[PDB]
Structure 1
Amino acid sequence: NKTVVVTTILESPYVMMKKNHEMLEGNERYEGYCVDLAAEIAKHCGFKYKLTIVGDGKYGARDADTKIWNGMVGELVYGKADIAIAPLTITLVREEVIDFSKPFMSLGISIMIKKGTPIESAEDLSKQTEIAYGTLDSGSTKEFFRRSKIAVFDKMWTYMRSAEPSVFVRTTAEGVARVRKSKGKYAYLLESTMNEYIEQRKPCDTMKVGGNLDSKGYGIATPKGSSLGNAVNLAVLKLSEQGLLDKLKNKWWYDKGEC
């Protein structure tokens, strides 16, 4: 019986450093939605675990011409972690190389603007040029636009992939800072979950506008054919049905919202 290595990512409010983390040890250094969820999954499946932050700070993408997976997906694919408990989006290209539980949280790509920005939709972004816009790198949102055959989204991708300087950012935090610092001249495309969270945080100067561009979910991921997969899947469904996932969302998004 071995300690399960959990890969996750510093992404608020999923996993964050506790204020006093320096004086704490192991799993106690972290807090957030996925820290709470990991404890519950492990309890219900009966395993001990170690939270580890993914080394390259990425979600997971396959390099073209190198074909190596980076991020949390890479940690699973190459045997460095036993399970990923993170806001990791269920996508076809990932499900081909790793296993996902049923989803524990729903989301869709969405638009973040600085308040007052003259934008209400993706169509709006696509039909103008004054306001720049981009996505996270090495994630499922970038891939959505890269692959889309829908005219509005193809138009946005054609713009974003060629825009200079780059409209892509390394972390969600970078995208949010760029929105806040650009006086309305930058909009950020990110998952509704993260958008909704930031909307509840000081300085309360951003907001989600328009509907979501797609509809999908986060899943708990394991290496393909892992024996952990079945129990983890059943645990997600149990925690869903018992209302835990709704409680955790309220706790980390809304209960202590600052706006």
Structure 2
Amino acid sequence: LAAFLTVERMESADDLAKQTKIEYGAVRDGSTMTFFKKSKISTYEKMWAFMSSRQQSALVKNSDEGIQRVLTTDYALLMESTSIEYVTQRNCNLTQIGGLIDSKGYGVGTPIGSPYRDKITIAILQLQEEGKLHMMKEKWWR
């Protein structure tokens, strides 16, 4: 009884990195994949080595396929935090492991030198100010 309980009671990216049973990856040609491909940090560099060797398999075509891989396989998806918030919010069997690996944001893209860019920034700032970005987030993530 004690040997059962002590073992089944004593038991991050590192945990994924220092092992091989659990497959892990990211969306092909996305900023997350690029992050690992260009990371000079040992552990992330170790992980890129893993998912790039098992490339055709570790990397997924899109997030829906990655989420499905997490559901039907022993697989961990390297996904952005607000997307993870949306998923775990709808499947109590799923969870976010560890904290954020980096900090960044989503922005509207425009061709280089577009007159619309600064105007869009001003507009985003307005929507933020009047609390609509919050409302929009709540509407969709519910």
TM-score range for the pair, normalised by the shorter chain length: 0.7 to 0.9
The residue that corresponds to 2:36 in the other structure is 145
Shift of 1:152: 1.0
More helix by share: 2
TM-score, normalising length: structure 1: 0.49
1:73-92 to 2 correspondence within 5 Å?
none
1:219 is aligned to 2:110:
no
Unaligned runs of 5+ in 2: 1-11
* SS in structure 2 at match of 1:166: helix
Alpha-carbon distance between aligned partners in 2 of 1:230 and 1:165, rounded to the nearest angstrom: 39
Shift of 1:231: 1.2
Shift of 1:205: 2.2
The residue that corresponds to 2:117 in the other structure is 229
The residue that corresponds to 1:180 in the other structure is 71
Alpha-carbon distance between aligned partners in 1 of 2:89 and 2:70, rounded to the nearest angstrom: 15
CA gap of 1:165–1:137, structure 2 versus 1, over 3 A, is closer
CA gap of 1:164–1:150, structure 2 versus 1, over 3 A, is closer
CA gap of 1:246–1:164, structure 2 versus 1, over 3 A, is closer
The list of structure 1 runs, each at least 4 consecutive aligned residues, that deviate by more than 3 angstroms after superposition, is none
Shift of 1:164: 6.2
Shift of 1:141: 0.3
Shift of 1:225: 1.2
Shift of 1:148: 0.3
Alpha-carbon distance between aligned partners in 1 of 2:119 and 2:55, rounded to the nearest angstrom: 47
Q: Deviations over 1:121-149 (max 9, x none)?
A: 00100011110100001110000000001
1:249 is aligned to 2:137:
yes
1:190 is aligned to 2:79:
yes
More strand by share: 1
* SS in structure 2 at match of 1:246: helix
TM-score, normalising length: structure 2: 0.88
Q: Deviations over 1:25-84 (max 9, x none)?
A: xxxxxxxxxxxxxxxxxxxxxxxxxxxxxxxxxxxxxxxxxxxxxxxxxxxxxxxxxxxx
1:28-43 to 2 correspondence within 5 Å?
none
Alpha-carbon distance between aligned partners in 2 of 1:148 and 1:241, rounded to the nearest angstrom: 35
1:64-79 to 2 correspondence within 5 Å?
none
Choose which of 27, 50, 55 in structure 2 pairs with 1:136. Answer: 27
Higher relative contact order (CA 8 A, sep 6+): 1
2:128 partner amino acid: S
Shift of 1:204: 3.0
Alpha-carbon distance between aligned partners in 1 of 2:131 and 2:58, rounded to the nearest angstrom: 39
Alpha-carbon distance between aligned partners in 2 of 1:154 and 1:187, rounded to the nearest angstrom: 17
1:241 partner amino acid: E
